[PDB]
Design a protein around this ligand. Structure first.
Ligand code: BCL
Ligand code: BCL
Ligand code: BCL
Ligand code: BCL
Ligand code: BCL
Ligand code: BCL
Ligand code: BCL
Ligand code: BCL
Ligand SMILES: CCCCCCCCCCCC(=O)OC[C@H]1O[C@H](OC(C)(C)CCC\C(C)=C/C=C/C(C)=C/C=C/C(C)=C/C=C/C=C(C)/C=C/C=C(C)/C=C/c2c(C)ccc(C)c2C)[C@H](O)[C@@H](O)[C@@H]1O
Ligand SMILES: CC(C)=CCC/C(C)=C/C=C/C(C)=C/C=C/C(C)=C/C=C/C=C(C)/C=C/C=C(C)/C=C/c1c(C)ccc(C)c1C
Lengths: 358, 56, 127, 122, 360, 357
């Protein structure tokens, strides 16, 4: 019958604190769409305010995933700060490790996200500007110590290709969107500009040769791209006055998929207007990119959302109405909420507007 | 979650433990003794049902 | 909010066909309950054993049965057994016809008015 | 871990039973014309618990019925009651009152005339 | 399994003879969430067209979109005189006004649109009776003037002029600005390849309203035959068959609970001659279907659709795939069976055929 | 709506991966073609021609009837994997539509260059699926123009290339008609602008023959079978016998009927440790048919029979089989039906079947 049992929970904090405990478990009997299974993964994201004076937050992400028979691990740790309202600066390190291979990397990239229109006629008229068209440039300088032989071989191959292939700048695009990514990208409204490789350099380090690559690209969003439209909302460094955590994971086999998520992070609540708060506008990139997998099996949802408001807060509006109320906990279960869960699980971008106020 | 308790029209019940405790033993009551088994089965049926019933 | 557990079947959430199906399913349920009540008035089984005691349901609906000849106000065991056989037959008829009614109410509630024996469907709006 | 919840609940029930047994021994009472003093206190405690437990599970199950009720219960809710009611009626015949209550002889007293003729036994 | 109800009633009242006119009514109710991140979304569209000058080819079309999205009121009015100059070219001289909340601004435009098919094969046209996929390309040459009588208008014009003359990648990224939201997907999902634009003019002047900003831009968009705006170029705008004012009043009232759609209008082009006096309903446009498929796949549903075809006097249907269920001597009714399958197929994004052939 | 499918795999004994595949499918769903009455009678064949050079002779026929229009296409080819990245074919064929007919000949070289061939990925990932790369595709086409339509089409093509420099860019719209263009995006493909080296014409035995030496580039992000599995899709070395696939197909308003029957190699591969693997499922078919498989809900009535060489028992069937009777493994219902619905609607999840030696 292909049931999908889910349970979501959003505990909030009072005042202007946009902090939230987001818990979410899911179990789906439908097969996953990964051509290699079983696929297991655990992702941790811990960010701490390192130098609040300059807006620097140290964010560390650890991915540990077994695919088929190979273990893979990607760790990153970067101090990220808002250089301006449109520019963000990151200095970080990390490593990748796949079976009998591994290599570290250090990067000093900068991301400049700028919209295409900043008209006030729209901001004063539309209180909920979901779509915001924009372009996000990345100037990425990354260094990798070529301790292993395969690293050196790939460096030599890239050097040969860039210096000989006149169409490297655009074919790299369909290189580094491996498999269905290059599809989902286009299905999310995202465009990628032909990269410019400002330079390849074998600037050796203290303990062996180091491949240093500086390259600039840009991804453009038609508004459905949350990484562009919701730019300032992606980075609550101002809100980060304490460590924020996320611990997610999924176990997938031909039998089905299981998902766990437990996080404490800000940006969950945003001011809709006039002292009224709102659970943040749902990002649309996850939904449209899920629609590339969620439309493959006919499923029936058993979902239950549990929004635990802070002490003294009331919900003034819920598009799918809440099923029950425990004087601070509002429960959505079945009815229109189940339809909306089936709608977003299959790729829908419908609005789930929870407005709440003290 | 997994939502182990899975109500269905085929919901006769498929936990091994609470399935074996689905026994009645309300017969030959001897109210002190075998109705105490009725009490035991109700307890060990509700406790799994409240924890988890159908993983199968 | 109309999501309270006592507003689940509210009219705003149901179409005319959904209401048709609900009423038909409830009428089949009603026939099943009527069969239960009938077999609750079978003082002596045709099998040849003492039967159900009196209940307020059947004692309520017994005068109608006597009026219709289904039951009897006779003390003779043989006649009461025959009338219990009549009650069992009418209750079985109610069970089967009410099962058909629940089936039809399910089809109307599921908006699937397709004949099991013929692949031709039907339109609630035009038939 | 809900294991400790059930552990505490069962321990509390067991302790209630043990306390009832102990105080039954403490409280000086003539047991009965026939019944013992080992089983009767346990019978009373069985009634005590079974009552409390039945009320608690009824409350809890009806709360979760109100929580989980939906349109999808269209056939799940009515038919269930039907079957339970059906079972109840059958339970009246096979378990609680097994028969029509004729006399020991089996004369099937069924009219007020013969009831009058019966109650005045010589 | 649990599915959502989708009720629909469509009616096509047709005229006989050389008259290709038709009345179209359509009511629909869907108990499914919409795919609009801004909800609720109300909208009413009123397209009115009239024959402005017979024997000259000029009609006047009046499109009146109005919508209320997230308690924000929007309204576009367009009044354009459109005329087919040649087979592959047409010209539109029009005016209009857009409005959002308190803000509003008017505009005027002169636009030449060419539509060149990629081939002129007589082999295909002598063999294929239904040339659906007629690939080609449309070239718009739009010139447009806006009275810049607001601070926001002049700010936007300033930003545009300082952007076009600064970044040479403007012509490439203007598209991802221009097709807001999922519309960019809908560019290729329907096979529509919007090309890099060419700004042929960015002048300004002083008109009676004050400063007026004039922009001329040419842009080409191609089609692999799935683009109904290209393959059906001569069939989507029947200026010759417009001997009477045609009207179309559409609208929807999509709440979070569902979508209510109401459409009612009379217009030509519903029927085309398939040869030998065998009239037929026009080939279904594929762009609306494939574009609605992006949203129609989000929920699993059961659909009860009632297609009524009210034929004129003494007209017999000859073939319909799927078949009609009840005739009533003129009102051919489709509902259930294979027609419900087809309605689900197209409402989920399908492009399956519904070839109603009918002759006197 | 029901989809009754019966699959039957019969693998040949020994190290050979030769197999006979039967597939009878019947779906009570409307097709996604603007022309519904669509019938096809595809018949692909291939026989060895010169093992000394690996030359194999392919013979494909695509007779079809769409909307009472007879559309037939035949291709004869002689193909060889010269370099294992460059493959060269010399062949001919004909295209006929209704009363129109015209022949063609071609000499085509396809160089499939992978972006990366690093040994780390190969040695760490046991089953590499996504191998992004690019095919550089050069074709010399010789088409006789003994018809007015061909003559004026050739003249119009010359005029178009001489008039617009966007011919290379805009020919992609003409090249993939209908949703085919979308099949490039959903399938991860990306076709580069064509490069015409000359639109010549030469005197022939009967009239002139137009010569088109045109080259393009088809890049794949890894989801493309022709890019990722370029070597394993053309087993000219494993062709010890003639191979033949016949695919009949019917579609009307009522439903779709498919009838595949084909003996061919490559239906099994080596996986290491002495365990052979029923080959990885191609991804382009699933993600391209998913563009039509999402248009209707259906109940799966699929059944798969796997017949293996005796003693080659299956290990790690994911999803698992239902019934095994001495080299007839059977899948029906359960997780297999879920996976059948998954791949019908566009899913590309793994159906891993391993059988021991
Ligand atoms: C380098 C990446 C960027 C960035 C990119 C994005 C993007 C893009 C999005 C967010 C979104 C959010 N981010 Mg952020 N985010 C950054 C740094 C931060 C910091 C911080 C101070 O460092 C904080 C506190 C947050 C917190 C938040 C919230 C404001 C918001 C999610 C709310 C929700 O309920 O989540 C619920 C959370 C859960 C469901 C848990 C999800 C856990 C998984 C493991 C994370 C996603 C993984 C993804 C599927 C796989 C990508 C792997 C990569 C290929 C390596 N981000 C950095 C600088 N963030 C989203 C949002 O709503 O924007 C308005 C959004 O669109
Ligand atoms: C016959 C006289 C009344 C009438 C009597 C009833 C009764 C009585 C009932 C309905 C029910 C309904 N009525 Mg009414 N109804 C009438 C006319 C109408 C009209 C109209 C005129 O068009 C409309 C629109 C409706 C609308 C509706 C729906 C709200 C609902 C049916 C859908 C459904 O959920 O059913 C399925 C509904 C159920 C699954 C829920 C109720 C289940 C019950 C409690 C199960 C009992 C089983 C059995 C009796 C148990 C044994 C108990 C022993 C007998 C002691 N009624 C007339 C005027 N209608 C039922 C409903 O629930 O209303 C909300 C209901 O109870
Ligand atoms: C309807 C759904 C159930 C059902 C539920 C019940 C219920 C409930 C009862 C019976 C009872 C009876 N059922 Mg029954 N019964 C069903 C199907 C049948 C069928 C059949 C053809 O399948 C038959 C032959 C019977 C037979 C019978 C009789 C044995 C008995 C008396 C019926 C009679 O007086 O009705 C007379 C009916 C007619 C005159 C038809 C018209 C009825 C009018 C419209 C009733 C409403 C009047 C009221 C004033 C409102 C009018 C409103 C408008 C102004 C018109 N049932 C199905 C399975 N059956 C009764 C019982 O056991 O009595 C003790 C009883 O009350
Ligand atoms: C339990 C009997 C239920 C019921 C259960 C079913 C079942 C089961 C089926 C339908 C089907 C249909 N029903 Mg019904 N339906 C009931 C009453 C109704 C009501 C109403 C409540 O107002 C409506 C609007 C309809 C309407 C419809 C059509 C849309 C459809 C037949 C198409 C047609 O051309 O058939 C021509 C004939 C019909 C319009 C008659 C439909 C009603 C019944 C079958 C006959 C008359 C009622 C009679 C007094 C009781 C006999 C019931 C039998 C015991 C089953 N029925 C009766 C009370 N309905 C049938 C189907 O799709 O047919 C192709 C089908 O298989
Ligand atoms: C939609 C796919 C194509 C497209 C294809 C066409 C087609 C096809 C036509 C035009 C036409 C026009 N196009 Mg254009 N065009 C598109 C995008 C644009 C954009 C832009 C969004 O930036 C601009 C500025 C223009 C500019 C213009 C004008 C030069 C001209 C008249 C506009 C107007 O008044 O229409 C009035 C607008 C309305 C009627 C609103 C509703 C529009 C829809 C598409 C009409 C549906 C008709 C309905 C099914 C039948 C109703 C019957 C009624 C009785 C009419 N196009 C996209 C890329 N364009 C026309 C022309 O060539 O003029 C010379 C023409 O025939
Ligand atoms: C500026 C726009 C273009 C144009 C663009 C198109 C396109 C593109 C298509 C049509 C289609 C049709 N048009 Mg036109 N149309 C033009 C002018 C006309 C004129 C005229 C003499 O002025 C007439 C009579 C028509 C009439 C018709 C029919 C021949 C045909 C629809 C048949 C059907 O049954 O519709 C049923 C009608 C309904 C279901 C009503 C739908 C109501 C909505 C409001 C109209 C569609 C709006 C769209 C979804 C949203 C546009 C939003 C934009 C942002 C502005 N159009 C102008 C010149 N028209 C289609 C056709 O089949 O072509 C062969 C088609 O592909
Ligand atoms: C499909 C994805 C790729 C692609 C990938 C490949 C691959 C891979 C090969 C070719 C080959 C060829 N390609 Mg190519 N090619 C594509 C698009 C094109 C287009 C076009 C209209 O756009 C053209 C003109 C060509 C032209 C050509 C020829 C020059 C050449 C030999 C043809 C042959 O004999 O066909 C014969 C045609 C048929 C057999 C029809 C059916 C084709 C399908 C794909 C076969 C599937 C196999 C089936 C499941 C099992 C068969 C078992 C049988 C017993 C054999 N390709 C796209 C972009 N091309 C070959 C080569 O390079 O030659 C040197 C080759 O190996
Ligand atoms: C010109 C085309 C290329 C070519 C391109 C491809 C592509 C591309 C694919 C294959 C695939 C396969 N090919 Mg090959 N292949 C070529 C030459 C060969 C030769 C040979 C000695 O000449 C042989 C024996 C094979 C055999 C095989 C198998 C190894 C494999 C299918 C296994 C399976 O289970 O099939 C089961 C078979 C059935 C389901 C029958 C399918 C029948 C239909 C008619 C074939 C597909 C037609 C397609 C949808 C429409 C083509 C339209 C064109 C416009 C003509 N190919 C030539 C040179 N081959 C697939 C594979 O696994 O790749 C790794 C794959 O994706
Ligand atoms: C009417 C029956 C009771 C039912 C009352 C309901 C209780 C509140 C229930 C919530 C009410 C409500 O509103 O919501 C209902 C919600 O239910 C559900 O949620 C759950 C939390 C899962 C329900 C389960 C709760 C629990 C496990 C069950 C109840 C708790 C239990 C275990 C109750 C019993 C406890 C005991 C037995 C109490 C008594 C124990 C203490 C005693 C006897 C003291 C002994 C003294 C000693 C030490 C010695 C004595 C001594 C002395 C002094 C002197 C001398 C001598 C000789 C001696 C011996 C759904 O999930 C929601 O949907 C739904 O809404
Ligand atoms: C087109 C239009 C406008 C429509 C016109 C269309 C028509 C004419 C209407 C059809 C109308 C029709 C035919 C609809 C008929 C609907 C029926 C028969 C439903 C009956 C439900 C029974 C209920 C609610 C259960 C109650 C249960 C209780 C609480 C019992 C409690 C109880 C009692 C009391 C005593 C003892 C014990 C132990 C208990 C538990």
């Amino acid at each position: 019958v292909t049931t999908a049992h889910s349970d979501y929970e959003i505990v909030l904090e009072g005042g202007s604190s946009s902090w939230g405990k987001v818990k979410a478990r899911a179990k789906v009997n439908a097969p996953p769409a990964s051509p290699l299974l079983p696929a297991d993964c655990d992702v941790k994201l811990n960010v701490k305010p390192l130098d609040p004076a300059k807006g620097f937050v140290r964010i560390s992400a650890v991915f540990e995933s077994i695919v088929d028979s190979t273990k893979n691990k990607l760790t990153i740790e970067a101090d990220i700060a808002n250089e301006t309202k449109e520019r963000r600066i990151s200095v970080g390190e990390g490593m990748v490790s796949v079976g009998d291979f591994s290599h570290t990397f250090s990067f000093e990239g900068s991301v400049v996200n700028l919209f295409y229109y900043r008209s006030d006629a729209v901001r004063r008229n539309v209180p909920n500007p979901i779509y915001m068209q924009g372009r996000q440039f990345h100037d990425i300088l990354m260094k990798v110590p070529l301790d292993n032989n395969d690293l050196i071989d790939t460096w030599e191959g890239t050097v040969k290709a860039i210096g000989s292939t006149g169409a490297f700048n655009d074919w790299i695009r369909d290189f580094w969107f491996i498999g269905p990514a290059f599809t989902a990208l286009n299905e999310g409204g995202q465009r990628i500009s032909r990269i410019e490789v400002n330079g390849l350099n074998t600037e050796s380090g203290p303990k062996g040769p180091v491949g240093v690559s500086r390259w600039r690209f840009s991804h453009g969003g038609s508004g459905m791209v949350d990484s562009i439209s919701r730019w300032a909302e992606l980075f609550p460094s101002d809100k980060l006055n304490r460590p924020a955590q996320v611990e997610a994971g999924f176990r997938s086999d031909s039998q089905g998929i299981e998902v766990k998520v437990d996080g404490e992070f800000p940006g969950v609540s945003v001011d809709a207007g006039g002292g009224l708060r709102r659970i943040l506008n749902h990002p649309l990139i996850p939904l449209v990119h899920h629609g590339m997998v969620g439309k493959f099996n006919n499923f029936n949802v058993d979902a239950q959302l549990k929004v635990v408001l802070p002490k003294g807060y009331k919900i003034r509006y819920a598009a799918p109405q809440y099923r029950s109320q425990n004087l601070e906990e509002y429960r959505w279960s079945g009815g229109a909420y189940a339809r909306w869960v089936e709608h977003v699980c299959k790729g829908g971008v419908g609005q789930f507007e929870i407005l709440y106020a003290q | 979650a997994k939502t182990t308790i899975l109500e269905v029209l085929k919901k006769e019940g498929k936990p091994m433990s609470a399935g074996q405790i689905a026994e009645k033993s309300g017969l030959e009551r001897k109210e002190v003794d075998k109705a105490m088994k009725s009490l035991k089965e109700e307890e060990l049926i509700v406790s799994p049902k409240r924890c988890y019933w159908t993983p199968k | 909010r109309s999501t309270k557990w006592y507003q689940i079947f509210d009219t705003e959430k149901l179409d005319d066909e959904q209401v048709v199906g609900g009423h038909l399913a409830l009428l089949g349920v009603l026939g099943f309950i009527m069969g239960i009540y009938y077999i609750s008035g079978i003082q002596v089984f045709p099998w040849g054993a003492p039967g159900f005691h009196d209940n307020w349901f059947y004692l309520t609906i017994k005068p109608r049965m006597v009026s219709l000849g289904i039951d009897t106000y006779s003390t003779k065991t043989a006649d009461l057994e025959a009338a219990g056989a009549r009650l069992l037959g009418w209750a079985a008829f109610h069970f089967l016809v009410g099962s058909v009614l629940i089936f039809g109410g399910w089809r109307h509630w599921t908006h699937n008015l397709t004949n099991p024996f013929t692949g031709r469907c039907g339109n609630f709006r035009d038939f | 871990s809900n294991g400790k919840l059930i552990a505490l609940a069962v321990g509390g029930a067991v302790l209630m039973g043990a306390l009832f047994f102990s105080v039954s021994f403490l409280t000086g009472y003539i047991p009965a014309p026939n019944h013992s003093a080992i089983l009767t206190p346990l019978r009373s405690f069985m009634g005590w618990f079974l009552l409390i437990f039945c009320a608690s599970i009824i409350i809890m199950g009806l709360g979760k019925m109100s929580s989980a009720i939906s349109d999808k219960w269209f056939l799940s809710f009515p038919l269930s009651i039907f079957v339970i009611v059906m079972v109840m009626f059958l339970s009246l015949r096979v378990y609680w009152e097994k028969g029509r209550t004729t006399t020991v002889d089996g004369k099937y007293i069924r009219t007020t005339a013969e009831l009058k003729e019966f109650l005045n036994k010589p």
